[PDB]
Design an enzyme around this catalytic site. Sequence first.
Site, PDB file in Angstrom:
ATOM      1  N   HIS A   1      15.669  53.026  31.795  1.00  0.00           N
ATOM      2  CA  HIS A   1      16.529  53.976  31.112  1.00  0.00           C
ATOM      3  C   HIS A   1      16.304  54.174  29.608  1.00  0.00           C
ATOM      4  O   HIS A   1      16.972  55.002  28.992  1.00  0.00           O
ATOM      5  CB  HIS A   1      17.983  53.577  31.381  1.00  0.00           C
ATOM      6  CG  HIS A   1      18.887  54.729  31.681  1.00  0.00           C
ATOM      7  ND1 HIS A   1      20.095  54.572  32.323  1.00  0.00           N
ATOM      8  CD2 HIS A   1      18.769  56.051  31.421  1.00  0.00           C
ATOM      9  CE1 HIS A   1      20.682  55.748  32.446  1.00  0.00           C
ATOM     10  NE2 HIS A   1      19.898  56.663  31.908  1.00  0.00           N
TER      11      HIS A   1
ATOM     12  N   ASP B   1      26.024  55.835  35.251  1.00  0.00           N
ATOM     13  CA  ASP B   1      25.557  54.472  35.096  1.00  0.00           C
ATOM     14  C   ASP B   1      26.692  53.458  35.259  1.00  0.00           C
ATOM     15  O   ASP B   1      27.857  53.770  35.031  1.00  0.00           O
ATOM     16  CB  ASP B   1      24.996  54.348  33.686  1.00  0.00           C
ATOM     17  CG  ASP B   1      24.023  53.212  33.536  1.00  0.00           C
ATOM     18  OD1 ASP B   1      24.322  52.113  34.043  1.00  0.00           O
ATOM     19  OD2 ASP B   1      22.967  53.429  32.894  1.00  0.00           O
TER      20      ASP B   1
ATOM     21  N   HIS C   1      26.579  51.058  33.472  1.00  0.00           N
ATOM     22  CA  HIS C   1      26.589  50.662  32.062  1.00  0.00           C
ATOM     23  C   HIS C   1      26.594  51.859  31.109  1.00  0.00           C
ATOM     24  O   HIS C   1      26.252  52.973  31.501  1.00  0.00           O
ATOM     25  CB  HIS C   1      25.364  49.790  31.757  1.00  0.00           C
ATOM     26  CG  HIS C   1      25.145  48.689  32.749  1.00  0.00           C
ATOM     27  ND1 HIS C   1      24.461  48.879  33.932  1.00  0.00           N
ATOM     28  CD2 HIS C   1      25.559  47.400  32.756  1.00  0.00           C
ATOM     29  CE1 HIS C   1      24.466  47.753  34.623  1.00  0.00           C
ATOM     30  NE2 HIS C   1      25.126  46.841  33.931  1.00  0.00           N
TER      31      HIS C   1
ATOM     32  N   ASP D   1      24.930  51.720  28.109  1.00  0.00           N
ATOM     33  CA  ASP D   1      23.656  51.706  27.412  1.00  0.00           C
ATOM     34  C   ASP D   1      23.841  52.247  25.999  1.00  0.00           C
ATOM     35  O   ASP D   1      23.041  53.058  25.517  1.00  0.00           O
ATOM     36  CB  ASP D   1      22.653  52.572  28.170  1.00  0.00           C
ATOM     37  CG  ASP D   1      22.439  52.097  29.596  1.00  0.00           C
ATOM     38  OD1 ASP D   1      21.775  52.816  30.370  1.00  0.00           O
ATOM     39  OD2 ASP D   1      22.936  51.004  29.942  1.00  0.00           O
TER      40      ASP D   1
ATOM     41  N   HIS E   1      16.596  49.314  27.215  1.00  0.00           N
ATOM     42  CA  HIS E   1      17.094  50.258  28.227  1.00  0.00           C
ATOM     43  C   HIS E   1      18.615  50.251  28.254  1.00  0.00           C
ATOM     44  O   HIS E   1      19.230  50.993  29.003  1.00  0.00           O
ATOM     45  CB  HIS E   1      16.540  49.971  29.635  1.00  0.00           C
ATOM     46  CG  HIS E   1      17.124  48.767  30.319  1.00  0.00           C
ATOM     47  ND1 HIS E   1      17.006  48.567  31.681  1.00  0.00           N
ATOM     48  CD2 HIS E   1      17.773  47.679  29.836  1.00  0.00           C
ATOM     49  CE1 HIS E   1      17.551  47.408  32.005  1.00  0.00           C
ATOM     50  NE2 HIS E   1      18.024  46.849  30.904  1.00  0.00           N
TER      51      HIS E   1
ATOM     52  N   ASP F   1      21.167  56.801  36.393  1.00  0.00           N
ATOM     53  CA  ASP F   1      20.656  55.438  36.480  1.00  0.00           C
ATOM     54  C   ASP F   1      21.027  54.999  37.893  1.00  0.00           C
ATOM     55  O   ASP F   1      22.203  55.004  38.275  1.00  0.00           O
ATOM     56  CB  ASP F   1      21.353  54.536  35.457  1.00  0.00           C
ATOM     57  CG  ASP F   1      20.966  53.070  35.595  1.00  0.00           C
ATOM     58  OD1 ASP F   1      20.304  52.716  36.588  1.00  0.00           O
ATOM     59  OD2 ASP F   1      21.338  52.265  34.707  1.00  0.00           O
TER      60      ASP F   1
ATOM     61  N   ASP G   1      21.510  52.280  39.210  1.00  0.00           N
ATOM     62  CA  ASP G   1      22.523  51.235  39.347  1.00  0.00           C
ATOM     63  C   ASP G   1      23.938  51.780  39.242  1.00  0.00           C
ATOM     64  O   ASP G   1      24.904  51.021  39.320  1.00  0.00           O
ATOM     65  CB  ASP G   1      22.339  50.090  38.332  1.00  0.00           C
ATOM     66  CG  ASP G   1      22.551  50.513  36.889  1.00  0.00           C
ATOM     67  OD1 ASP G   1      23.379  51.403  36.602  1.00  0.00           O
ATOM     68  OD2 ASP G   1      21.886  49.911  36.021  1.00  0.00           O
TER      69      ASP G   1
ATOM     70  N   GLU H   1      15.499  53.540  36.580  1.00  0.00           N
ATOM     71  CA  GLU H   1      15.725  52.164  37.023  1.00  0.00           C
ATOM     72  C   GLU H   1      15.454  51.776  38.483  1.00  0.00           C
ATOM     73  O   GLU H   1      15.987  50.778  38.965  1.00  0.00           O
ATOM     74  CB  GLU H   1      17.147  51.741  36.630  1.00  0.00           C
ATOM     75  CG  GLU H   1      17.452  51.793  35.129  1.00  0.00           C
ATOM     76  CD  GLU H   1      16.795  50.669  34.340  1.00  0.00           C
ATOM     77  OE1 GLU H   1      16.852  49.501  34.779  1.00  0.00           O
ATOM     78  OE2 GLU H   1      16.237  50.945  33.262  1.00  0.00           O
TER      79      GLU H   1
HETATM   80 MN    MN Z   1      21.137  52.662  32.463  1.00  0.00          MN
HETATM   81 MN    MN Z   2      22.935  50.532  34.265  1.00  0.00          MN
HETATM   82 ZN    ZN Z   3      19.624  45.413  30.669  1.00  0.00          ZN
END
Ligand code: MN
Ligand code: MN
Ligand code: ZN
Lengths: 313, 313, 313
Positions: free
Chosen positions: A97, A120, A122, A124, A137, A228, A230, A273
């Site tokens: 990412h 995501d 996350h 980021d 990332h 992403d 994930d 990812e």
């Molecule tokens: Mn990400």
């Molecule tokens: Mn993520």
């Molecule tokens: Zn990481």
Amino acid sequence: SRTIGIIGAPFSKGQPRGGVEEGPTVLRKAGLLEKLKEQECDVKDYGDLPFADIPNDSPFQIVKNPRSVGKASEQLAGKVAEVKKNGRISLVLGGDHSLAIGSISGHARVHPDLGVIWVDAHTDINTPLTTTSGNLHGQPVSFLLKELKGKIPDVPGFSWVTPCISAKDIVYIGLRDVDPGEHYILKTLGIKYFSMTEVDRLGIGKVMEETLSYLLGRKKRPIHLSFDVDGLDPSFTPATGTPVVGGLTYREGLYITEEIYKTGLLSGLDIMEVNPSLGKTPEEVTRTVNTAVAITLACFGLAREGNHKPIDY
Amino acid sequence: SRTIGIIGAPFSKGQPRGGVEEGPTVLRKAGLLEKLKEQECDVKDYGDLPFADIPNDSPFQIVKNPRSVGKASEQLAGKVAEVKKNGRISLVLGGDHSLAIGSISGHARVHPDLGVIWVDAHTDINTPLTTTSGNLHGQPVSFLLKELKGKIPDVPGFSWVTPCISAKDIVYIGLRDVDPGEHYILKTLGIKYFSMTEVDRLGIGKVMEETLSYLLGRKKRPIHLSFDVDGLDPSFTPATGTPVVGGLTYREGLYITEEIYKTGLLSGLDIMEVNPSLGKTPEEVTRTVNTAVAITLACFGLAREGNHKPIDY
Amino acid sequence: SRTIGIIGAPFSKGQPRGGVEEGPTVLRKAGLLEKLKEQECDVKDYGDLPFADIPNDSPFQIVKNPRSVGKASEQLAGKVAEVKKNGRISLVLGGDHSLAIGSISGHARVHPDLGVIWVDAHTDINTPLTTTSGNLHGQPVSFLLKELKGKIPDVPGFSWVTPCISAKDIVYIGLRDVDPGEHYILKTLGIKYFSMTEVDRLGIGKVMEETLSYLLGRKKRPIHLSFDVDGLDPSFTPATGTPVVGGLTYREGLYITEEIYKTGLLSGLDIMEVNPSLGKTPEEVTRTVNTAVAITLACFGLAREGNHKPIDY
Ligand SMILES: [Mn+2]
Ligand SMILES: [Mn+2]
Ligand SMILES: [Zn+2]
Ligand SMILES: [Mn+2]
Ligand SMILES: [Mn+2]
Ligand SMILES: [Mn+2]
Ligand SMILES: [Mn+2]
Ligand SMILES: [Zn+2]
Ligand SMILES: [Zn+2]
């Protein structure tokens, strides 16, 4: 017809587990391009971006591979900016990412009014001064934000960078693993987001209604979707670097993308990812790849209800 | 009390994988009849329909086993029409979904005002002129529709057939794998449906509110529920011929059926496409069978909240 | 800051499968206490309650281990009442759900106005005269209800008991396996509940809005959350004594608890029925334990959106 432009980006220096490198590869042999054409799409693959090696790339404080990440992104941006100028939508098949930095940067050069949907687990949004891992990332958003124009020091390879988006131009969907510093930045810059809590509370239906009206309330504008892998639950996309349980459902992933397509405003799409080398089994890899591909086709018209071209069947 | 009438139908010539044949068998040894009686039900099993072999049944254009499918359905219709005339609800434990042709046909002979809820990942509305496989378990709806009275040529074994339902009398729930010709027929005949997109958008709660008011808006009428096991996700009903990921949840499957029961208008129920020979493991077979049975009991009163007979406990 | 008080309760005589005994153990080695402290929590572990053996504990009619269950609960109540008086929230890491009897009993001694949220696939409201198994972990609610002050005979070890809650002070969430006598008690005592049917119909979002306004409509008051691990689906909490498919989702489990925390009124929390010895694999045990822990931390502040302490990051 909304035309596409494939951009393979086998980069991985944004995180430790290098398997993401050969991610654009596993996606193409899955038949992605073919399936896109198999649709009403007009597809042109610009090939994989060869990211030459930068051996002499020591750490900058805690930040790892800064010149390698900055280079791979500065290049990608130049490419992204190329396809968008060639009247097409940018499809960036990535590795990690961190590439978003360059992907969104290039897209903006062409459409500075763009809006971003960041799917995501996350945010980021860590900075070199907040990151606790050093893996870039998990810091790309911090480099694209104009508000953060001050708390991000100069990183080798990111001189070419110039923040291209405000806090009110990005929407997160899927969050479920956010650092304390990251949360602080959200509340402070007043960033719009729908964590898994809000998704559970509202439903993916309303969450999509609200994010789209948030982004397109005042005016319609080019939409960049940074997806992403994930963001979805590990039972669907297991072969990824940093999996978090309690993620977005297969169906929810498709809803997200079907609704974006229906807006007719998709101009930029990132698929990041995906790391086949982390799947504990051959089928886990396949499961992840098929899901990635499926989310991809939905962005370009494939709807679960059905498809029919304008012809008397 | 709403009384039931078991109709076993070990037929499979509607599709290639013959395992569906011995599907009514695996359901009974699961204790279905027993469990129905174990409830407030009055159950009468009319036995399995012995579908004699029709060796001389070559293809008709692309359509496979037309005389075998047409015969097994013309027979079933005669049986369905029998139990319904004997004041009971028809419970057709099937093999493949081509049997619906005869099941809904017979039910209509008794209650011509009936309404249909078709739970499937597919619409099974292809015609001999649109089908691309020739398997008749993906064409039954095309034979029951009055609007399509013109685009369906005469198939050996389907002379006895006479379209018994309008496009505005059927509701689909669960769709996620529809052909282009099939989609075209939907939009054209204005067929009501809730694909997985709408289920994700609205929720199974509203989807059931809307389908029931759609069907019972003007007047109450006998309800026929055609439940194809592949309507649910493969993680629940794996042992089926044509599985599609992103399906209906176990809970959603139960909600569907609990709400139908509460309408007090269920008169016809089909339980199709269960094929134990396709389960990759003994438990996959069990998982599929238990789910099928569970959806069955919910149609007849079993509610997750609880059950209590009118007696001072 | 809402302060916590760990109460380990390695009891199991409320049901046959004794593995639940060493449940408070597997939770602590998971780092629960540590993780609670790792949060903004002020934690004090009062140690595991040593429940001496009562060899001479024959059945009372059909009820099993009545003196052992009554003793372990009368003790726990005395402890629960102790931490609550020491300005803390009671965290009871249990074995079987029969312990609720003592846990809610003690909490009430301090806050008699308390309200209960009972998350379970079961109502655990059977009486010695209705129970069909004799296992007391499926009868605790029947002992705490004032309305049932009449239909519950005197059980050896439960003399000290005195019903401490009305039918309108408890809300069930998750029900999907209720006996006929149990259902009857619900409708009769007019007990508030959201079975899986209502959860599917309404959504966990509205279900939480409705349960909280139901409990806190007239006035705010101490909230006791009794969380039976089988309330969640077996794919998340497999290592439990009596699993029922079609349960609450991981996400839904977290939503439940995140919303309770946000009420700022949590005073009592029970984490029961976790039995590592029933997990078919080492990972099934881990899966169950991690989920239990996760639901725990959410009760005390851990939110999927993020956490940030009041400091200029
Ligand atoms: Mn990400
Ligand atoms: Mn993520
Ligand atoms: Zn990481
Ligand atoms: Mn189907
Ligand atoms: Mn079907
Ligand atoms: Mn239970
Ligand atoms: Mn319980
Ligand atoms: Zn087929
Ligand atoms: Zn029990």
